[PDB]
Amino acid sequence: MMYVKLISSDGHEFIVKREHALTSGTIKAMLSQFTNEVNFREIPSHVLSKVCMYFTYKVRYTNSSTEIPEFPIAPEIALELLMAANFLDC
Amino acid sequence: SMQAARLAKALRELGQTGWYWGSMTVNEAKEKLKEAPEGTFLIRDSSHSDYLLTISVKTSAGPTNLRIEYQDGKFRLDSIICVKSKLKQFDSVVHLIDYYVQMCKDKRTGPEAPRNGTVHLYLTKPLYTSAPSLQHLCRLTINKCTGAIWGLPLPTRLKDYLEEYKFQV
Amino acid sequence: MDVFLMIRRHKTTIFTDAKESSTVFELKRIVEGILKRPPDEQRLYKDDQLLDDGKTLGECGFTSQTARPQAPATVGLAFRADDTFEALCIEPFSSPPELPDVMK
Numbered sequence: 001m002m003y004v005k006l007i008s009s010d011g012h013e014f015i016v017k018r019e020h021a022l023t024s025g026t027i028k029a030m031l032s033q034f035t036n037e038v039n040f041r042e043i044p045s046h047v048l049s050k051v052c053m054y055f056t057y058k059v060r061y062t063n064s065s066t067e068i069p070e071f072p073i074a075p076e077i078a079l080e081l082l083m084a085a086n087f088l089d090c
Numbered sequence: 091s092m093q094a095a096r097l098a099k100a101l102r103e104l105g106q107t108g109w110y111w112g113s114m115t116v117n118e119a120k121e122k123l124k125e126a127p128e129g130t131f132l133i134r135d136s137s138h139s140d141y142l143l144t145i146s147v148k149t150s151a152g153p154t155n156l157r158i159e160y161q162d163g164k165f166r167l168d169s170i171i172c173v174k175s176k177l178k179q180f181d182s183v184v185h186l187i188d189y190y191v192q193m194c195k196d197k198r199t200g201p202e203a204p205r206n207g208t209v210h211l212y213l214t215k216p217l218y219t220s221a222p223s224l225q226h227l228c229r230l231t232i233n234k235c236t237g238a239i240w241g242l243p244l245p246t247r248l249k250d251y252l253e254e255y256k257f258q259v
Numbered sequence: 260m261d262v263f264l265m266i267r268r269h270k271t272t273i274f275t276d277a278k279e280s281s282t283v284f285e286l287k288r289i290v291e292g293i294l295k296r297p298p299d300e301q302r303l304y305k306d307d308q309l310l311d312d313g314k315t316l317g318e319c320g321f322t323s324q325t326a327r328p329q330a331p332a333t334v335g336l337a338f339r340a341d342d343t344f345e346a347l348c349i350e351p352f353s354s355p356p357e358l359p360d361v362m363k
């Protein structure tokens with residue numbers, strides 16, 4: 001309940017705080033269906049790992065009490081990351 | 091009018107930036123930019139009756155402020171600063187900002203002030219109010235790689251989304 | 260003060276945060292809560308280097324500048340299999356595709 005497991009299409013398992021995963025409107029609808037586990041049969045680990053870093057960054061930087069830094073995105077992942085982000089609603 | 095529709099779009103784009111601070115006083119901007127690196131900027135509503143918007147930007151001497159004029163469907167930097175022919179006009183205020191950021195990024199202008207009185211505006215990174223959506227961050231990244239979005243291997247739904255905000259900042 | 264980490268073993272990756280003044284042992288207490296293995300059945304690594312349980316994460320090199328939320332630092336994890344600890348083994352993520360010509 002404190003953590004949830006997100007599994008990529010190539011079998012990588014990402015364990016992240018539930019509050020963080022709820023950054024995704026799609027994940028939120030699934031948990032808030034089904035277990036504390038979501039399988040993404042079409043998102044591979046080089047994309048899902050980046051999505052999880054975005055969750056951490058979004059939760060940390062809702063306020064501007066701290067200068068918000070740049071979220072780096074390699075050009076090589078941006079097209080897939082865009083599609084995953086659209087699918088996840090985040 | 092088509093003028094009104096272009097102004098409504100300009101304000102929509104502004105709401106997508108993530109660096110539009112809305113109602114923010116000049117002193118609140120001063121405090122917010124005090125510790126930021128040189129060139130950090132934001133856009134906020136102007137307190138002046140005749141202006142919609144004002145850029146606040148960190149200089150090496152501290153934060154300073156530059157109003158944006160809107161006249162007959164066109165934005166440009168405040169013309170008390172320089173002759174208007176040297177202040178490029180834009181239908182879109184985010185486009186205006188993007189232009190000046192890209193001039194600095196391309197090292198066509200730098201932090202040193204010009205010596206012949208042409209426009210001096212050193213902009214590097216925006217100050218975000220909040221983390222933007224991951225979709226918008228991908229959008230910025232794609233925009234920095236290409237302008238030819240309609241040839242991308244994406245569904246038309248996502249090309250429409252890129253087409254809504256073509257700026258690199 | 261805060262450092263942001265990925266604790267990685269085989270095809271498991273835990274996203275978690277700690278303080279610069281947190282100890283390695285406190286990190287294993289995080290791992291135990293999640294993966295249900297006690298601290299004496301864990302070895303934590305920065306690159307190829309075993310981390311001593313009594314050190315702070317800063318003493319091992321995990322600083323706020325190098326372990327950020329948008330770019331967390333990676334901590335390697337190896338479990339004890341009966342008498343013996345397993346070799347450290349982190350499975351790579353998939354490789355990204357080649358860029359389309361327009362975005363090169």
Ligand SMILES: O=C(Cc1ccc(F)cc1)N[C@@H](Cc1ccc(OP(=O)(O)O)cc1)C(=O)NCc1ccc(F)cc1
Nearest residue numbers: 116117120136137138144153154155156157171210211
């Ligand atoms: O910045 C300041 C001083 C100041 C700073 C911090 C602070 F807390 C209070 C005042 N003076 C501006 C005028 C100004 C003031 C307030 C405003 O805000 P507004 O009344 O809300 O629109 C808009 C403009 C100014 O001398 N600019 C010349 C210039 C030309 C070119 C260039 F590239 C950048 C700047």
